[PDB]
Amino acid sequence: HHHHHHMERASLIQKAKLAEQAERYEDMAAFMKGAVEKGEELSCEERNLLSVAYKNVVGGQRAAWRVLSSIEQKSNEEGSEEKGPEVREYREKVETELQGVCDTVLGLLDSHLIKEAGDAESRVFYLKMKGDYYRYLAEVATGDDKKRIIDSARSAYQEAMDISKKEMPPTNPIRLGLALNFSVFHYEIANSPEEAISLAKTTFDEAMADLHTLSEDSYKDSTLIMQLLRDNLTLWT
């Protein structure tokens, strides 16, 4: 007997939708976290609520971390030690909150969503998200710890790649976004620029060749991501 448990899931989902309208993304993520923890799979729309909520939370933290790390680097070039300790301390604080959010997302993926994922679109979506959030840890880690995170991310992305190559057309936006993010992983994190350019080129070309087969809506989703694949390629070449 689970009616009260179903109605709680539905209340959380609804409050997440409200938090999204209100642009209150920390709340949105807490609500979606609760909904995931009720046990059921997520619909396509629920997957996107989950993704949008945590993408905003961790996006604000990464932009913050990048700004502070930029300041801290220039401060270990001048000897400017008078305002020295505070930049380091505050960078480390933001960094720890960033890592906590990624751990939360990774906990949801590995404990609930990846294993209970019905179809193939869903497995690719969650596996890609797993790679992304390890990638976000990798942006702040150093040394051998960074190299272990890289291994987990590469491993999640490669498995999403294998499923997407067999199950989805080259123009599918989830496949395209996965390949884009994997290619960003190769150049900015795993220092595999050749693999990044080769992956971004192949993904762009194979999508380009099928664009004439798409509806107007499919075509707009696919080409928006193709412009990012090419802008990256411009920057990497």
Binding site: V52, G177, L178, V184, E188, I225, L228, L235
Partner: peptide, 8 residues
């Protein structure tokens, strides 16, 4: 960052 990932 000039590099871009997937906006979702």
């Amino acid at each position: 960052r000039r590099v871009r990932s997937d906006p979702g």
